[PDB]
């Protein structure tokens, strides 16, 4: 039981770091929006498939 | 001869008692071993996940 609790503790920090460094990936790639509801990655459009 | 036969009968009674106790003890051992094996498996699994 003790060892299982310790493992859960460690997994918490693992997921914390995962989201931490996934938040920094927005510093490189921005996803944006404007009033007409078009979307831009790095300022270039990408409409829906159709 | 009669006394010897009576002593043998009592010995048989005690043998039956011992046999019943053995059966109960074996059931207990079975249950314990089941739990022990399951615990060892779970212990190893948790250790691997930790690593």
Curated annotation (Swiss-Prot), chain A:
<comment type="subunit">
    <text>Component of the PI3K (PI3KC3/PI3K-III/class III phosphatidylinositol 3-kinase) complex II (PI3KC3-C2) in which the core composed of the catalytic subunit PIK3C3, the regulatory subunit PIK3R4 and BECN1 is associated with UVRAG; in the complex interacts directly with BECN1. PI3KC3-C2 can associate with further regulatory subunits such as RUBCN and probably SH3GLB1/Bif-1. Interacts with SH3GLB1; UVRAG bridges the interaction to BECN1 indicative for an association with the PI3K complex PI3KC3-C2. Interacts with RINT1.</text>
</comment>
<comment type="function">
    <text>Versatile protein that is involved in regulation of different cellular pathways implicated in membrane trafficking. Involved in regulation of the COPI-dependent retrograde transport from Golgi and the endoplasmic reticulum by associating with the NRZ complex; the function is dependent on its binding to phosphatidylinositol 3-phosphate (PtdIns(3)P). During autophagy acts as a regulatory subunit of the alternative PI3K complex II (PI3KC3-C2) that mediates formation of phosphatidylinositol 3-phosphate and is believed to be involved in maturation of autophagosomes and endocytosis.</text>
</comment>
<comment type="function">
    <text>Involved in maintaining chromosomal stability. Promotes DNA double-strand break (DSB) repair by association with DNA-dependent protein kinase complex DNA-PK and activating it in non-homologous end joining (NHEJ). Required for centrosome stability and proper chromosome segregation.</text>
</comment>
<protein>
    <recommendedName>
        <fullName>UV radiation resistance-associated gene protein</fullName>
    </recommendedName>
</protein>
UniProtKB/Swiss-Prot annotation, chain B:
<protein>
    <recommendedName>
        <fullName>Beclin-1-C 35 kDa</fullName>
    </recommendedName>
</protein>
